[PDB]
Design an enzyme around this catalytic site. Sequence first.
Site, PDB file in Angstrom:
ATOM      1  N   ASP A  25      44.732  18.923  59.209  1.00  0.00           N
ATOM      2  CA  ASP A  25      44.153  19.186  60.528  1.00  0.00           C
ATOM      3  C   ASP A  25      42.802  19.904  60.536  1.00  0.00           C
ATOM      4  O   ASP A  25      42.754  21.132  60.512  1.00  0.00           O
ATOM      5  CB  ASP A  25      45.207  20.022  61.269  1.00  0.00           C
ATOM      6  N   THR A  26      41.709  19.157  60.656  1.00  0.00           N
ATOM      7  CA  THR A  26      40.389  19.797  60.667  1.00  0.00           C
ATOM      8  C   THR A  26      40.122  20.571  61.960  1.00  0.00           C
ATOM      9  O   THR A  26      39.227  21.412  62.007  1.00  0.00           O
ATOM     10  CB  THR A  26      39.268  18.787  60.435  1.00  0.00           C
ATOM     11  N   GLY A  27      40.917  20.302  62.991  1.00  0.00           N
ATOM     12  CA  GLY A  27      40.754  20.990  64.261  1.00  0.00           C
ATOM     13  C   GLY A  27      41.560  22.272  64.378  1.00  0.00           C
ATOM     14  O   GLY A  27      41.595  22.891  65.440  1.00  0.00           O
TER      15      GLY A  27
HETATM   16  C1  LIG Z   1      45.808  15.561  71.443  1.00  0.00           C
HETATM   17  C2  LIG Z   1      46.077  17.051  71.259  1.00  0.00           C
HETATM   18  C3  LIG Z   1      44.742  17.788  71.237  1.00  0.00           C
HETATM   19  C4  LIG Z   1      46.913  17.537  72.437  1.00  0.00           C
HETATM   20  N1  LIG Z   1      46.808  17.265  69.998  1.00  0.00           N
HETATM   21  C5  LIG Z   1      47.021  18.462  69.443  1.00  0.00           C
HETATM   22  O1  LIG Z   1      46.614  19.520  69.926  1.00  0.00           O
HETATM   23  C6  LIG Z   1      47.810  18.468  68.135  1.00  0.00           C
HETATM   24  C7  LIG Z   1      49.301  18.686  68.418  1.00  0.00           C
HETATM   25  C8  LIG Z   1      50.154  18.775  67.159  1.00  0.00           C
HETATM   26  C9  LIG Z   1      49.577  19.808  66.205  1.00  0.00           C
HETATM   27  C10 LIG Z   1      48.096  19.561  65.961  1.00  0.00           C
HETATM   28  N2  LIG Z   1      47.306  19.543  67.236  1.00  0.00           N
HETATM   29  C11 LIG Z   1      45.884  19.256  66.935  1.00  0.00           C
HETATM   30  C12 LIG Z   1      45.227  20.521  66.410  1.00  0.00           C
HETATM   31  O2  LIG Z   1      43.994  20.193  65.762  1.00  0.00           O
HETATM   32  C13 LIG Z   1      44.977  21.530  67.545  1.00  0.00           C
HETATM   33  C14 LIG Z   1      43.908  21.002  68.506  1.00  0.00           C
HETATM   34  C15 LIG Z   1      43.126  22.107  69.159  1.00  0.00           C
HETATM   35  C16 LIG Z   1      43.602  22.753  70.300  1.00  0.00           C
HETATM   36  C17 LIG Z   1      42.920  23.830  70.840  1.00  0.00           C
HETATM   37  C18 LIG Z   1      41.747  24.258  70.239  1.00  0.00           C
HETATM   38  C19 LIG Z   1      41.260  23.624  69.118  1.00  0.00           C
HETATM   39  C20 LIG Z   1      41.942  22.558  68.591  1.00  0.00           C
HETATM   40  O3  LIG Z   1      41.059  25.343  70.721  1.00  0.00           O
HETATM   41  C21 LIG Z   1      40.951  26.473  69.878  1.00  0.00           C
HETATM   42  C22 LIG Z   1      42.277  27.220  69.820  1.00  0.00           C
HETATM   43  C23 LIG Z   1      42.498  27.813  68.448  1.00  0.00           C
HETATM   44  C24 LIG Z   1      42.909  26.779  67.418  1.00  0.00           C
HETATM   45  O4  LIG Z   1      42.152  26.475  66.497  1.00  0.00           O
HETATM   46  N3  LIG Z   1      44.105  26.222  67.588  1.00  0.00           N
HETATM   47  C25 LIG Z   1      44.637  25.220  66.650  1.00  0.00           C
HETATM   48  C26 LIG Z   1      45.748  25.844  65.809  1.00  0.00           C
HETATM   49  C27 LIG Z   1      45.294  27.080  65.080  1.00  0.00           C
HETATM   50  N4  LIG Z   1      45.305  28.214  65.773  1.00  0.00           N
HETATM   51  O5  LIG Z   1      44.916  27.020  63.914  1.00  0.00           O
HETATM   52  C28 LIG Z   1      45.171  23.957  67.315  1.00  0.00           C
HETATM   53  O6  LIG Z   1      46.120  24.006  68.098  1.00  0.00           O
HETATM   54  N5  LIG Z   1      44.561  22.823  66.987  1.00  0.00           N
END
Ligand SMILES: CC(C)(C)NC(=O)[C@@H]1CCCCN1C[C@@H](O)[C@@H]1Cc2ccc(cc2)OCCCC(=O)N[C@@H](CC(N)=O)C(=O)N1
Lengths: 99, 99
Positions: A25-27
Amino acid sequence: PQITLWKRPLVTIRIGGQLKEALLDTGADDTVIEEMNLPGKWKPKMIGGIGGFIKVRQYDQIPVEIAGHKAIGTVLVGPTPVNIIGRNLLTQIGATLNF
Amino acid sequence: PQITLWKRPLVTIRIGGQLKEALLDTGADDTVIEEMNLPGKWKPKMIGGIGGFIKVRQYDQIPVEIAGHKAIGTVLVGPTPVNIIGRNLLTQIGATLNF
Ligand SMILES: CC(C)(C)NC(=O)[C@@H]1CCCCN1C[C@@H](O)[C@@H]1Cc2ccc(cc2)OCCCC(=O)N[C@@H](CC(N)=O)C(=O)N1
Protein backbone atom coordinates in the site's frame (compact mmCIF):
# COMPACT_ATOMS: atom_id res chain seq x y z
CA PRO A 1 9.94 -8.19 -8.96
CA GLN A 2 7.79 -5.85 -11.07
CA ILE A 3 4.14 -5.86 -10.04
CA THR A 4 1.30 -4.61 -12.24
CA LEU A 5 -1.91 -3.23 -10.72
CA TRP A 6 -4.64 -5.07 -12.69
CA LYS A 7 -5.18 -7.08 -9.50
CA ARG A 8 -4.67 -6.17 -5.84
CA PRO A 9 -0.93 -6.16 -5.02
CA LEU A 10 -1.35 -8.89 -2.38
CA VAL A 11 1.79 -10.71 -1.26
CA THR A 12 2.69 -13.27 1.41
CA ILE A 13 4.55 -11.97 4.45
CA ARG A 14 6.04 -13.71 7.46
CA ILE A 15 5.56 -12.03 10.82
CA GLY A 16 5.95 -13.60 14.26
CA GLY A 17 6.88 -16.87 12.58
CA GLN A 18 3.46 -16.89 10.91
CA LEU A 19 2.60 -16.45 7.21
CA LYS A 20 -0.07 -13.92 6.19
CA GLU A 21 -1.37 -12.08 3.11
CA ALA A 22 -0.86 -8.32 2.89
CA LEU A 23 -1.47 -5.46 0.47
CA LEU A 24 1.51 -3.39 -0.79
CA ASP A 25 0.00 0.00 0.00
CA THR A 26 1.78 3.15 -1.22
CA GLY A 27 -1.10 5.25 0.11
CA ALA A 28 -0.51 4.11 3.70
CA ASP A 29 2.06 5.84 5.91
CA ASP A 30 2.04 2.89 8.31
CA THR A 31 1.81 -0.88 8.28
CA VAL A 32 -1.45 -2.15 9.82
CA ILE A 33 -2.07 -5.85 10.48
CA GLU A 34 -5.31 -7.56 11.56
CA GLU A 35 -5.60 -8.41 15.26
CA MET A 36 -3.11 -11.16 16.16
CA ASN A 37 -0.70 -12.16 18.94
CA LEU A 38 2.73 -10.54 18.59
CA PRO A 39 5.55 -10.94 21.14
CA GLY A 40 6.98 -7.96 23.00
CA LYS A 41 5.44 -4.82 24.48
CA TRP A 42 2.97 -2.47 22.75
CA LYS A 43 1.70 1.09 23.26
CA PRO A 44 -1.87 2.21 22.46
CA LYS A 45 -2.21 4.42 19.38
CA MET A 46 -4.79 5.90 17.00
CA ILE A 47 -4.49 6.13 13.22
CA GLY A 48 -6.85 7.42 10.58
CA GLY A 49 -8.04 6.17 7.24
CA ILE A 50 -10.96 6.81 4.89
CA GLY A 51 -13.84 6.25 7.32
CA GLY A 52 -12.27 7.70 10.45
CA PHE A 53 -9.91 6.87 13.31
CA ILE A 54 -9.30 3.49 14.91
CA LYS A 55 -7.36 2.34 17.98
CA VAL A 56 -4.35 0.08 17.36
CA ARG A 57 -1.49 -1.56 19.28
CA GLN A 58 1.93 -0.22 18.28
CA TYR A 59 4.79 -2.77 18.23
CA ASP A 60 8.31 -1.52 17.40
CA GLN A 61 11.33 -3.19 15.75
CA ILE A 62 9.26 -6.12 14.49
CA PRO A 63 10.96 -8.34 11.88
CA VAL A 64 8.77 -8.71 8.77
CA GLU A 65 9.66 -10.72 5.66
CA ILE A 66 7.94 -9.36 2.55
CA ALA A 67 8.20 -11.64 -0.50
CA GLY A 68 11.54 -12.90 0.76
CA HIS A 69 12.79 -9.39 1.52
CA LYS A 70 13.73 -8.49 5.08
CA ALA A 71 12.40 -5.48 7.01
CA ILE A 72 12.42 -4.56 10.71
CA GLY A 73 10.10 -1.81 11.83
CA THR A 74 6.89 -0.55 13.37
CA VAL A 75 3.81 -2.71 12.92
CA LEU A 76 0.35 -1.52 14.06
CA VAL A 77 -2.13 -4.23 15.08
CA GLY A 78 -5.83 -3.44 15.00
CA PRO A 79 -9.27 -3.86 13.35
CA THR A 80 -8.25 -3.25 9.72
CA PRO A 81 -10.30 -4.59 6.74
CA VAL A 82 -7.09 -6.07 5.26
CA ASN A 83 -3.39 -6.38 6.16
CA ILE A 84 -1.45 -3.50 4.63
CA ILE A 85 2.27 -2.90 4.20
CA GLY A 86 2.81 0.85 4.28
CA ARG A 87 5.62 3.20 3.30
CA ASN A 88 7.53 2.63 6.56
CA LEU A 89 8.35 -0.94 5.41
CA LEU A 90 8.14 -0.41 1.63
CA THR A 91 11.13 1.95 1.82
CA GLN A 92 13.14 -0.71 3.67
CA ILE A 93 12.81 -3.18 0.78
CA GLY A 94 13.52 -0.42 -1.74
CA ALA A 95 10.04 -0.41 -3.28
CA THR A 96 9.31 2.33 -5.86
CA LEU A 97 6.47 3.41 -8.16
CA ASN A 98 7.26 3.45 -11.87
CA PHE A 99 5.39 4.55 -15.00
CA PRO B 1 9.56 8.30 -13.92
CA GLN B 2 10.53 6.53 -10.69
CA ILE B 3 8.95 7.63 -7.41
CA THR B 4 10.55 6.78 -4.04
CA LEU B 5 8.38 6.27 -0.93
CA TRP B 6 10.24 8.41 1.63
CA LYS B 7 7.30 10.81 1.39
CA ARG B 8 3.67 10.39 0.34
CA PRO B 9 3.58 9.91 -3.46
CA LEU B 10 1.69 13.13 -4.26
CA VAL B 11 1.40 14.22 -7.90
CA THR B 12 -0.51 16.84 -9.88
CA ILE B 13 -3.64 15.65 -11.72
CA ARG B 14 -6.23 17.43 -13.87
CA ILE B 15 -9.92 16.62 -13.48
CA GLY B 16 -12.90 18.60 -14.73
CA GLY B 17 -10.58 21.35 -15.88
CA GLN B 18 -8.95 21.78 -12.46
CA LEU B 19 -5.44 21.03 -11.20
CA LYS B 20 -5.21 19.00 -7.98
CA GLU B 21 -2.59 17.16 -5.92
CA ALA B 22 -3.41 13.48 -5.56
CA LEU B 23 -1.92 10.41 -3.90
CA LEU B 24 -0.83 7.43 -6.08
CA ASP B 25 -2.30 4.61 -4.04
CA THR B 26 -1.66 0.97 -4.94
CA GLY B 27 -3.84 -0.11 -2.02
CA ALA B 28 -6.95 1.72 -3.28
CA ASP B 29 -9.25 -0.24 -5.63
CA ASP B 30 -10.98 2.97 -6.67
CA THR B 31 -10.16 6.65 -7.22
CA VAL B 32 -11.64 9.01 -4.61
CA ILE B 33 -11.59 12.76 -5.20
CA GLU B 34 -12.32 15.54 -2.72
CA GLU B 35 -15.74 17.20 -2.90
CA MET B 36 -16.18 19.18 -6.13
CA ASN B 37 -19.14 20.12 -8.30
CA LEU B 38 -18.46 17.88 -11.27
CA PRO B 39 -21.08 17.95 -14.07
CA GLY B 40 -22.79 14.78 -15.22
CA LYS B 41 -25.01 12.00 -13.91
CA TRP B 42 -23.92 10.11 -10.78
CA LYS B 43 -25.03 7.13 -8.67
CA PRO B 44 -24.94 6.91 -4.84
CA LYS B 45 -22.27 4.57 -3.45
CA MET B 46 -20.62 3.60 -0.17
CA ILE B 47 -16.90 2.79 0.04
CA GLY B 48 -15.10 1.46 3.08
CA GLY B 49 -11.60 1.58 4.43
CA ILE B 50 -9.85 1.88 7.78
CA GLY B 51 -12.24 4.03 9.73
CA GLY B 52 -15.44 2.57 8.26
CA PHE B 53 -17.57 3.68 5.30
CA ILE B 54 -18.27 7.04 3.67
CA LYS B 55 -20.95 8.02 1.14
CA VAL B 56 -19.73 9.08 -2.31
CA ARG B 57 -21.12 9.94 -5.74
CA GLN B 58 -19.98 7.66 -8.56
CA TYR B 59 -19.14 9.39 -11.86
CA ASP B 60 -18.20 7.23 -14.87
CA GLN B 61 -16.02 8.01 -17.89
CA ILE B 62 -14.30 11.00 -16.28
CA PRO B 63 -11.14 12.20 -18.12
CA VAL B 64 -8.25 12.50 -15.66
CA GLU B 65 -4.69 13.49 -16.57
CA ILE B 66 -2.04 12.09 -14.19
CA ALA B 67 1.40 13.72 -14.55
CA GLY B 68 0.82 14.32 -18.24
CA HIS B 69 -0.53 10.78 -18.72
CA LYS B 70 -4.11 10.75 -19.97
CA ALA B 71 -6.60 8.34 -18.42
CA ILE B 72 -10.37 7.95 -18.16
CA GLY B 73 -12.58 6.02 -15.79
CA THR B 74 -14.78 5.93 -12.69
CA VAL B 75 -14.20 8.72 -10.13
CA LEU B 76 -15.83 8.72 -6.67
CA VAL B 77 -16.49 12.21 -5.21
CA GLY B 78 -16.89 12.49 -1.47
CA PRO B 79 -15.65 13.85 1.87
CA THR B 80 -12.11 12.42 1.62
CA PRO B 81 -9.17 14.04 3.48
CA VAL B 82 -7.01 13.60 0.38
CA ASN B 83 -7.40 12.90 -3.36
CA ILE B 84 -6.63 9.23 -4.02
CA ILE B 85 -5.71 7.77 -7.42
CA GLY B 86 -6.56 4.09 -7.26
CA ARG B 87 -5.63 1.05 -9.32
CA ASN B 88 -8.47 1.66 -11.80
CA LEU B 89 -6.53 4.65 -13.16
CA LEU B 90 -2.95 3.58 -12.29
CA THR B 91 -3.21 0.60 -14.64
CA GLN B 92 -4.14 3.00 -17.47
CA ILE B 93 -0.88 4.97 -17.09
CA GLY B 94 1.13 1.74 -16.83
CA ALA B 95 2.12 2.20 -13.19
CA THR B 96 4.04 -0.65 -11.47
CA LEU B 97 5.59 -1.51 -8.08
CA ASN B 98 9.26 -2.50 -8.28
CA PHE B 99 11.60 -3.90 -5.59
C1 LIG C 1 -10.97 3.20 -2.10
C2 LIG C 1 -10.53 3.47 -0.66
C3 LIG C 1 -9.70 4.74 -0.64
C4 LIG C 1 -11.78 3.65 0.20
N1 LIG C 1 -9.75 2.32 -0.16
C5 LIG C 1 -9.05 2.33 0.97
O1 LIG C 1 -8.98 3.30 1.73
C6 LIG C 1 -8.31 1.03 1.31
C7 LIG C 1 -9.17 0.14 2.21
C8 LIG C 1 -8.48 -1.14 2.65
C9 LIG C 1 -7.12 -0.82 3.27
C10 LIG C 1 -6.30 0.07 2.35
N2 LIG C 1 -7.02 1.34 2.00
C11 LIG C 1 -6.19 2.15 1.07
C12 LIG C 1 -5.10 2.84 1.86
O2 LIG C 1 -4.07 3.30 0.97
C13 LIG C 1 -5.67 4.03 2.67
C14 LIG C 1 -6.13 5.14 1.73
C15 LIG C 1 -6.02 6.50 2.35
C16 LIG C 1 -7.03 7.00 3.18
C17 LIG C 1 -6.87 8.22 3.83
C18 LIG C 1 -5.71 8.94 3.64
C19 LIG C 1 -4.71 8.47 2.82
C20 LIG C 1 -4.87 7.27 2.18
O3 LIG C 1 -5.50 10.14 4.29
C21 LIG C 1 -4.43 10.20 5.21
C22 LIG C 1 -4.79 9.45 6.49
C23 LIG C 1 -3.57 8.78 7.07
C24 LIG C 1 -3.17 7.53 6.32
O4 LIG C 1 -2.13 7.49 5.67
N3 LIG C 1 -4.02 6.50 6.40
C25 LIG C 1 -3.74 5.22 5.73
C26 LIG C 1 -3.37 4.17 6.78
C27 LIG C 1 -2.21 4.59 7.64
N4 LIG C 1 -2.49 5.39 8.66
O5 LIG C 1 -1.07 4.23 7.37
C28 LIG C 1 -4.90 4.69 4.89
O6 LIG C 1 -5.98 4.41 5.40
N5 LIG C 1 -4.65 4.54 3.59
